[PDB]
Design a protein around this ligand. Structure first.
Ligand code: K
Ligand code: MG
Ligand code: MG
Ligand code: MG
Ligand code: MG
Ligand code: MG
Ligand code: MG
Ligand code: MG
Ligand code: MG
Ligand code: MG
Ligand code: MG
Ligand code: MG
Ligand code: MG
Ligand code: MG
Ligand code: MG
Ligand code: MG
Ligand code: MG
Ligand code: MG
Ligand code: MG
Lengths: 260, 139
RNA sequence: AACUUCGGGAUAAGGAUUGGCUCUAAGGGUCGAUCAACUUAGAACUGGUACGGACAAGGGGAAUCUGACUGUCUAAUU
RNA sequence: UAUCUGGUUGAUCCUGCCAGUAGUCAUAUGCUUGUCUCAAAGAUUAAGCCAUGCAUGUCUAAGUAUAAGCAAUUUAUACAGUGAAACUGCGAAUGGCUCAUUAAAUCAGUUAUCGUUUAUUUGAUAGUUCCUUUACUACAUGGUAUAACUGUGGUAAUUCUAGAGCUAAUACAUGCUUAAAAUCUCGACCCUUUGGAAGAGAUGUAUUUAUUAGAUAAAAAAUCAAUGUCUUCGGACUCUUUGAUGAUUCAUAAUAACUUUUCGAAUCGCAUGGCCUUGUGCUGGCGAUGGUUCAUUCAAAUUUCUGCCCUAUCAACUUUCGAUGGUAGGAUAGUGGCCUACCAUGGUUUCAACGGGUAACGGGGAAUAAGGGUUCGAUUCCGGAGAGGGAGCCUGAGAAACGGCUACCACAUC
RNA sequence: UUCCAACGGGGCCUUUCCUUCUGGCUAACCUUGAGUCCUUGUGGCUCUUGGCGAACCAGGACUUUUACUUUGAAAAAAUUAGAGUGUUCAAAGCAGGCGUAUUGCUCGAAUAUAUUAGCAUGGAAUAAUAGAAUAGGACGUUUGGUUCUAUUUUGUUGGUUUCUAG
RNA sequence: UAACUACUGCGAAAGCAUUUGCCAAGGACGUUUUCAUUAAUCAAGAACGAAAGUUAGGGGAUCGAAGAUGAUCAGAUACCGUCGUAGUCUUAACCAUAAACUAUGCCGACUAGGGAUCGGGUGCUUGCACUCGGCACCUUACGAGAAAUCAAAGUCUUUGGGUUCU
RNA sequence: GGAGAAUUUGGACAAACUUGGUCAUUUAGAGGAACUAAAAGUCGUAACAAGGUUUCCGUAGGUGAACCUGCGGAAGGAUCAU
């Protein structure tokens, strides 16, 4: 329609932001940025809707223009900045550091982390190819170009990133036995060990994933994200740890809390 | 036969035979593995033909959908029509109906007659109609 | 186009083109050589956009009366 | 949320319809109407016509202030605060409206770009610019040419503008800048040696073409083009560099040139520090805007598969003057009869082509609902199209834009 | 617990495709350098030495072809069904709920359906399809011809006959 | 083309009846012959199709639309009576319809007694039985049906063998 | 000493207007000929009983009107019968 769209209607928003239907008509349209639109969480959502610090979209700007909040160690003044998976939101006041990571329902958790952990983030490597003057580089899932990587690093490997420097500290090869975070689909937010990979040339590779309670499931390779070795998560995981209980089993765990 | 029948000279682009390096082996004929377990015919590697649109000895890449169908016309030059038959479910009657579609297909001189079953691969638009290249013959 | 005895109506109606020059192509005969007609189609160029350049050469359509048609007669008013 | 009843007969059993019955985010209308919550609403006919008002503009510490503007209370003979105007930049391509067109079109799910463009965001990324490199060429910083503004005016009339005079830039147009080294061609000189060397030029990036590398299926040596090892010297004779894809002429790197020669910061704020050679020396922080390319994101364009209502009182359609394909070119961001030239005679169809109709925009959905179905979907979300009707087009990353222009047509204003 | 079963699932053997081979890796458990660590000898180990590779990855090598069905994945949100929640009830909404109510703790915003098409996967009944009949048929460590392909060498490019190796 | 002439035959139906030749055709039966799925039903498209009717030659006895004509009658160009044109027959062309009717599509299977009869075959004790295939018929109704009725009009709410048409 | 206005050649795109052609959709019309309301009026009496000539089908001719007659069918006949 003549050129790019600047609005987003509240119903056409991502469901996983959990915006109320009545209060509004539009919803905050993510600016262009590191993450894809439907996979992001605008800061205005994070501040106002999720943490309950701001009450309006004016107050979100009041907070952003003080230059408190910083995403991956750099200050941002954009209400609709597209923060996404593995990003570190650091507030100076409070001294709360959070990492955006999916709970099991497939929604961004309020996952508070220690100040040590906030030094780094993981990065799924998307493409690895040779740049100008023969200099090799990798491309992470948040679109960071990193030049001069370890030649062991191939596509689909995760890569630990220093943030301050923005350099590869360490990496994890994609193989059988590695822990995984599923970052899309029905099984968004589940955690589990890789079992084997199905090939399918000129198609979509699939990844069988066991979990701690011995429930297998398959996803597309595009939705998988390596996060460690077996029982050795590089980041801190949220409460649950990507388990997926039945609606029955969930309802039983409410009746423990119901006692009070 | 002939090869040089057209008004222009027929060559694979950016493939220099070089008269200076005098050797009586053969002309540099380029070819490629098409992919997806499709064998390059010997006729592609050995033969003299030039075809901008051949998926072995040309600049087209096979990607997207692989389809099969019976050959129903071989009267165009370097292209054919195939018939893909199928059954279409009508849910009110819990029954099917035979439908069909014709798909025009580029055929390299590597290969085909009326009656033959062929596998064909999707490629960039080659003509007004043709978006498919013969990549295997099975009769 | 109506209509029709299916033969017609019909050149229906209604349009476009046409010179000069320089070329190209196709179409043959006789023993690969050799000999020879005009026909047709195309292209470039060119001009006071002319050009079936004089001559030669249908106006057409919608209906009605009437005799079917070609044919014949009042030489000197039909 | 699986139900029927009245109506042909003198009476009967049927067929069979008519009538009843209930629903309708389904319109109108009649009569009637206290309260709370919620709330559709010029779609249907006329995508008919429209008076008036308004619906798009925008400024920070940080492009341009001599407002003959407001201050000033004293941060300043350059400016320094707060600021009309105008230039510059960005936006005005979103939104909102409507449903006329449109029936393999749109649209839905599903693919593809190894078939392309992409403002912006985010992440990377630029010692190689003078060319006589001993004439000049400022880099302690280069050229005019203009607005607002001040005057002089026209016009019945408009977001009309002429003439004259000033003057800014992140506008416009120029133009220097700063480490080594390696490698290539050229080659002075001497010496015919399995000869080698001053010093000469070039080597960023982008542009265009041609060429080259971009290996790999396991173990042996013959025979040397030999004329290069490494001097153990019978010439031991090894070790070499090679990323990605299912797949490439991919990425990338060379080589030779090419270019109405692209870019490679003459820009702006707030801090004012460190060295001393106390000259306005050298060096230096936080970050604004800018910029080449790659990546990214927001997109865009094209695209694969299957799916659409009634109609045969539409059975053949397409191909002159692109129909289907081939070759080459042109054009495009790019693929492609997209267009041109030449050549072939193809392409669709009773499994319904082609044609006609639609009181047809598609879909998510809605109504009714034993099960199966039937009917509706102009309308809150998604996609498309349009802005009286047609066509053309400037600007710009993006428009064939209409609260942009140009023309014709229709309508209408002063 | 073992056993009484029923019902389902996998692997063996029985004239029994359970694609084939070529290096990764032999994990393992009839490989045993210290045997009795140890509930009814069917409720069993401390590892060395080629191993036995169907436990598990990419390679050439060629693979009758569908339909149907299972599971998975997909099929925006809203709407539909539907869980939780005293909006005073309800239509709704996505809230809310417990504290020392004096500087705070906490559960949520599920789940299901949506085929026809395409994708991945298990099954091989049903229904179609192909194969050796003028054998141009199958398997083959044979036994020749013939046809190209090029790897570590033989210094290294290159010329270049072979042994190979496919 | 009488009588013979029938609840008899043949034919896809329309239809087909004196004798004898000639020409091809066909069902059924018999078969330890042959091929091996070649089939069933069929939009489109075709052949044949009573009578009447049409065109042009032949023919033209009889009957007879029209018409003439005598009665009847209120009328009677109606029935009745006497004549009579086309027609009735044939050759070459057309026409394409009928209560063209069993008012019952075709193919296949199954469900129940009975005797007659036509064609072929087999056994015989030579006129009877069995058998296949036909035209029908009688009883019952298991079933079916609104009923009349129906051995198909049955095997349909216990609802699905295949298929055309309306 | 390079920008650069009017103007202008050829080109593609091409509105719009004449002009035929064609398809679709509405609509006027003297007069004509039907149909229905429709059952009542006029004239008969064709059908229903052997409906007073059994009825009906196809066809063909006749004609105030129902109808009548020929040829060939049918029984849905007034005969399941020698
Ligand atoms: K005459
Ligand atoms: Mg819009
Ligand atoms: Mg005429
Ligand atoms: Mg004429
Ligand atoms: Mg005359
Ligand atoms: Mg006279
Ligand atoms: Mg081309
Ligand atoms: Mg419409
Ligand atoms: Mg709609
Ligand atoms: Mg409408
Ligand atoms: Mg309007
Ligand atoms: Mg538009
Ligand atoms: Mg416009
Ligand atoms: Mg407007
Ligand atoms: Mg607008
Ligand atoms: Mg028929
Ligand atoms: Mg009939
Ligand atoms: Mg009577
Ligand atoms: Mg009577």
């Amino acid at each position: 329609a003549r050129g790019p769209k600047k609005h987003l209607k509240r119903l056409a928003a991502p469901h996983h932001w959990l915006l109320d239907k009545l209060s509004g008509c539009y919803a905050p349209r993510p600016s262009a940025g590191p993450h894809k639109l439907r996979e992001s969480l605008p800061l205005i959502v994070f501040l106002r809707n999720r943490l309950k610090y701001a009450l309006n979209g004016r107050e979100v700007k009041a907070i952003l223009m003080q230059r408190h909040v910083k995403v991956d160690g750099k200050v941002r003044t954009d209400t609709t900045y597209p923060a996404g998976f593995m990003d570190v939101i650091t507030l100076d006041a409070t001294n709360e550091n959070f990492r955006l990571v999916y709970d099991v329902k497939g929604r961004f958790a309020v996952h508070r982390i220690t100040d040590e952990e906030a030094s780094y983030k993981l990065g799924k490597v998307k493409k690895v190819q040779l740049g100008k003057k023969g200099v090799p580089y990798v491309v992470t899932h948040d679109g960071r170009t990193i030049r001069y990587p370890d030649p062991n690093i191939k596509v689909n490997d995760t890569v630990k990133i220093d943030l301050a420097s923005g350099k590869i500290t360490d990496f994890i090869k994609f193989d059988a036995g590695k822990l995984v975070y599923v970052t899309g689909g029905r099984n968004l937010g589940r955690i589990g060990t890789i079992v084997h990979k199905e090939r399918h040339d000129g198609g979509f590779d699939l990844v069988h994933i066991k979990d701690s309670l011995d429930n297998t499931f398959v996803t597309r390779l595009n939705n998988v994200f390596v996060i460690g070795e077996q029982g050795k998560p590089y980041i801190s995981l949220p409460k649950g740890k990507g388990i997926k209980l039945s609606i029955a089993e969930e309802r039983d765990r409410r009746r423990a809390q119901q006692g009070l | 036969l002939t090869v040089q029948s057209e008004r222009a000279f027929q060559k694979q682009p950016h493939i220099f035979n070089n008269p200076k390096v005098k050797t009586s082996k053969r002309t540099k004929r380029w070819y490629k593995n098409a992919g997806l377990g499709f064998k390059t015919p010997k006729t592609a590697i050995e033969g003299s033909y030039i075809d901008k649109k051949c998926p072995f000895t040309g600049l087209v890449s096979i990607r997207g959908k692989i389809l099969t169908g019976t050959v129903v016309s071989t009267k165009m030059h370097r292209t054919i029509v195939i018939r893909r038959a199928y059954l279409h479910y009508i849910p009110k009657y819990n029954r099917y109906e035979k439908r069909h579609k014709n798909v025009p297909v580029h055929v390299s001189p590597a290969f085909v007659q009326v009656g033959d079953i062929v596998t064909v691969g999707q490629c960039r638009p080659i003509s007004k109609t043709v978006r498919f290249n013969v990549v295997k013959v099975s009769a």
